Amino acid sequence: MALQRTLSIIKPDAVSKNVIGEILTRFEKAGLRVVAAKMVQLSEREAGGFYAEHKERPFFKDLVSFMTSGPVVVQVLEGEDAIAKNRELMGATDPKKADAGTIRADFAVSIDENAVHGSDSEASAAREIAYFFAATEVCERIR
Amino acid sequence: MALQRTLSIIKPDAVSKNVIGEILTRFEKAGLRVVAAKMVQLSEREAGGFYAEHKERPFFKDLVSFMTSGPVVVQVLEGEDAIAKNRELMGATDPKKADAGTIRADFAVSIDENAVHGSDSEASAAREIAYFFAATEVCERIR
Amino acid sequence: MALQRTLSIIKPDAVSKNVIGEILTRFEKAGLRVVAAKMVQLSEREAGGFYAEHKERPFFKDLVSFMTSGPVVVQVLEGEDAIAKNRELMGATDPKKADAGTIRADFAVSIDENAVHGSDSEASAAREIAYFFAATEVCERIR
Amino acid sequence: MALQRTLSIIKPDAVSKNVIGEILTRFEKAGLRVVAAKMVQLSEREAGGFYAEHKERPFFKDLVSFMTSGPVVVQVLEGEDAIAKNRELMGATDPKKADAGTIRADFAVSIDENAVHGSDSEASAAREIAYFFAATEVCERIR
């Protein structure tokens, strides 16, 4: 299948325990290419807009409060079947249900503080990436 | 003695061979904290301005050529005695003369393609960091 | 009917002759709102990844050459029927065929150096804006 | 003495009443050059850091409230004795006391909502500019 893109956010729990290099290597080892990256401190509004999807959900407030508790790292990953592949090595959203070797298994403390977020689909990825990055900022690799 | 900052650039050789995660983890393992990060592709001018110090030096233009051949990753590392510490684990500029365990030993192919650059002092760090980052972009860790 | 958005680029001819304030006020007087703005020096690469649409056109080379000859200003304009309105006060692409009172009439020297560019439809606007700006950077205002 | 730089912030009062074009043209007419610009929505944290100088002053709280109430425009102006020239055009901080023709006279409603901020010295300018802009983002004019 064709090369796709997905968004990776390293959440503040993983940033603050200094496991950024560790997490990014996992993606690279799986054959994904990091084609954009920037560390940013999300404002309240910025977080609300990204998770606008879940605005009417129950725990939107806690999610937002956690995602703005410190700096995150926002990333675009490129490669063959990138969406499903990112998802695989990240593992189940719930860390206690995650497989051995996944990022959720190895770095996540709880449901809330689950280390990293990833795009769940083809369509979700396009929106999530466009939200954080202008198209010119994405530097797909040439050599 | 105090916490300092230094600039790390992962050069295009290391970006294109997908060793970014690997290199960042080395920094983190040594107890440095990544407090800013962004992937950019340097334009001709960007590069010239950063290495303005060596403009007068003869090869300069091969360095410029190399640094703009593809995307790089620019980061700010924070921690105790951060300058000397970054330099330690980076290793000698010349990769053949670097020790075992350093980034130059493990990732660098030649003098020219030597994987990464780092600030070489207290004062050069301030200038190099200010060149790539506004002070508000630097996100000191609170959690 | 509905409030829309369009992209404004003040090209390097107009930037270098210091007419930025003049042009922006024209937009504002017409009831459009500037909801994003940044001055950038477009790289040779950036070059019309923007103008990818005219990549096969003959004189593409000169357009790109001109658009990177100096700094431009990239803007998002918001308001009722913003697309047609921007186009109205901008005027015809040829400055000599442009109507009196328009930007092309008042600031443009030639076909090549025609002061400013604008989005030509709803669909082209969405693409052009997304190219230069992440959605979070666009600040619709309240107060 | 040579060309200098100063920071201009168009505050949210002036942004929301759509006088950005008007204010910028004033600067340009005076022979100052806009060499950087970006519209931003300052978070609490961003604003507090910029006015860190007045953090022990009593009124601080209201200043911060106002500066984050909506989007602002941050600008770097370059030209001969740019610092005193920016200050001339702007007028007295207190709009009552401002001369005719100045920005404070023509756009400012009160002490709090005084339309725009500027750097007050060489030294304050260097820090204010560095705070919002990396040195590479500043595009001094060619051509």
Say if CB A86 and CB A77 are below 8 A apart: yes
D123 phi-psi bin (left φ>0, alpha ψ -120 to 50, beta other): alpha
* φ/ψ (deg, to 5) at B8: -115, 130
Sign of CA pseudo-dihedral C75, C78, C82, C86: negative
Is residue A117 annotated as a catalytic residue, yes or no?
yes
Whether C34 and chain D come into contact, CB under 8 Å, resolves to yes
Report the Cα–Cα distance between both ends of chain C, in Å, rounded: 22
Asked if A34 reaches chain B (Cβ–Cβ under 8 Å), the answer is: yes
Give the Å distances, CA to CA, from A127 to A13, A68, A120, B82, C71. Answer: 24, 20, 11, 38, 29
**Contact assessment for residue B34 and residue B20, using Cβ atoms and an 8 Å cutoff:** no
Q: How far apart are CA B132 and CA B67, in angstroms?
A: 15
DSSP annotation of C55 reads: T
Which residue carries 């959203």 as its tokens? A93
**Binary contact (A133, C133; C-beta < 8 A):** no
* CA D11 vs CA C25, D26, D39, D94, D104: distances in Å: 17, 16, 10, 15, 12
Residue A110 touches partner D, C-beta closer than 8 Å:
no
Helix (H) or strand (E) holding D6: strand D3-10
For residues C135 and A130, the answer to whether their CB atoms sit within 8 Å is: yes
Q: Residue D118 forms beta bridges with which residues?
A: D8
Do residues D34 and D27 touch, judged by C-beta distance below 8 A? yes
Q: C-alpha distances in angstroms, D84 versus C43, D6, D116?
A: 34, 9, 15
Burial group, residue A57, by CB count within 10 angstroms (0-12, 13-18, 19+): exposed
Contacts of A66 (CB under 8 A, 6+ apart): A11, A12, A13, A112, A113
- Closest among B40, B23, B32, B36 to B117, alpha carbons compared: B23
Distances from the Cα of B15 to the Cαs of A8, A44, B85, C61, C64, in angstroms?
17, 32, 22, 30, 28
Q: State both tokens at C119.
A: 């989005």
**Option in B49, B50, B130 nearest D130 (CB):** B130
Roughly what angle, to the nearest 10 degrees, separates helices A20-29 and B20-29? 150
Across the interface, whether the CB atoms of D134 and B136 are under 8 A apart is answered no
The whole-angstrom separation of Cα D37 and Cα A34 is 29
E-strand stretches of chain A: 3-10, 33-40, 72-80, 116-118
C-alpha distances out from residue A51 to A13, A70, A100, C16, Å: 18, 17, 28, 42
- Put simply, the answer to whether B130 touches D135 (Cβ < 8 Å) is yes
- Specify the amino acid at residue C62: D
A105 CB-contact burial (10 Å; exposed 0-12 / middle 13-18 / buried 19+)? middle
Burial degree of B114 (CB within 10 A; 0-12, 13-18, 19+): buried
* Closest chain B residue to C45, measured at CA: B43
Residue B82: CB partners within 8 Å, gap ≥ 6?
B3, B4, B5, B6, B32
Give the integer Cα–Cα distance in Å for D105 and D107: 6
Secondary structure (H, E, C), chain B: CCEEEEEEEECHHHHHCCCHHHHHHHHHHCCCEEEEEEEECCCHHHHHHHCHHHCCCCCHHHHHHHHCCCCEEEEEEEEECHHHHHHHHHCCCCHHHCCCCCHHHHHCCCCCCCCEEECCCHHHHHHHHHHHCCCCCCCCCCC
Round to whole Å and give the CA distance between A49 and C137: 11
3-state secondary structure D70-109: CCEEEEEEEEECHHHHHHHHHCCCCHHHCCCCCHHHHHCC
Q: What tokens does B125 get?
A: 């760090």
Q: How far apart are CA B70 and CA C82, in angstroms?
A: 38
Number of other CB atoms surrounding residue D94 within 10 Å: 12
| D5-14 as b/e: b if 16+ CB within 10 A | bbbbbbbbbb
Q: How far apart are CA A75 and CA D80, in angstroms?
A: 42
In which region does residue B12 sit, left (phi positive, over 0), alpha (psi from -120 to 50) or beta (all else)? alpha
Residues D7, D74: contact at Cβ < 8 Å? yes
- Measure A97 CA to nearest chain C CA, in Å: 33
- How many structural domains does chain B have? 1
Separation CA D84–CA D106 (nearest Å) = 19
| Alpha carbon distance C99, A14 (integer Å) | 58
Task: Say whether residue C46 is in contact with chain A using an 8 A CB cutoff.
Answer: yes
Its domain, for residue C32, covers 1-143
Classify burial at B2, counting beta carbons within 10 Å of its beta carbon; exposed 0-12, middle 13-18, buried 19 or more.
exposed
CA distances from C48 to B80, B83, C86 (A): 45, 40, 21
What's at C67, amino acid-wise? M
AA letter at A41: Q
Question: Could you give the CA distance from residue B76 to residue B57 in angstroms, rounded to a whole number?
Answer: 26
Contact C130, A130 (CB under 8 A): yes
- What gap in Å lies between CA D134 and CA C38, rounded to an integer? 14
Q: Which of D63, D71, D114 is nearest to D90 (CA)?
A: D114
* Cβ neighbours for D118, distance < 8 A, ≥ 6 positions apart: D6, D7, D8, D9, D86, D87, D90
Which residues fall within 8 angstroms of residue D2, CB to CB, at 6 or more apart?
Answer: D80
Element spanning C9, H or E: strand C3-10
Helix (H) or strand (E) holding A128: helix A122-132
Contact by Cβ (8 Å): B50, B133: no
- Locate tokens 């110090």: which residue? B53
Q: How far is D59 from chain C (nearest CA, A)?
A: 21
Neighbour subunits, D (≥3 Cβ pairs < 8 A): A, B, C
Order of strands, edge to edge, in the sheet holding C33-40?
A: C116-118, C3-10, C72-80, C33-40, D33-40, D72-80, D3-10, D116-118
Q: Which residue has the tokens 């009722």?
A: C80
> Quick one: which of B38, B21, B23, B28 has its CA closest to B108?
B23
Chain D contact present for C35, CB below 8 A: yes
How many helices (H) and strands (E) chain A has is answered by: 7, 4
Q: How far is CA A118 from CA A33, B103, D41, in A?
A: 15, 29, 26
Kindly determine whether residue C130 and residue A135, on different chains, have CB atoms separated by under 8 Å: yes
What type of residue is A39? M
Q: CATH number of the domain that B50 lies in?
A: 3.30.70.141
A91 class by beta-carbon count within 10 Å (0-12 exposed, 13-18 middle, 19+ buried): buried
Question: Which segments within C51-134 are labelled E, that is strand?
Answer: 72-80, 116-118
Dihedral of alpha carbons A48, A54, A60, A65, sign? negative
| Rounded CA separation A117/C122 (Å) | 32
In a mutational test of the C interface, the residue from A5, A129, A131, A136 whose CB has the highest number of chain C CBs within 10 Å is A136
**What does the alpha-carbon distance between residue C109 and residue D28 come to, in Å, rounded to a whole number?**
20
Angstroms from B2 CA to nearest CA on chain C? 36
A30 φ, ψ (degrees, to nearest 5): -75, -5
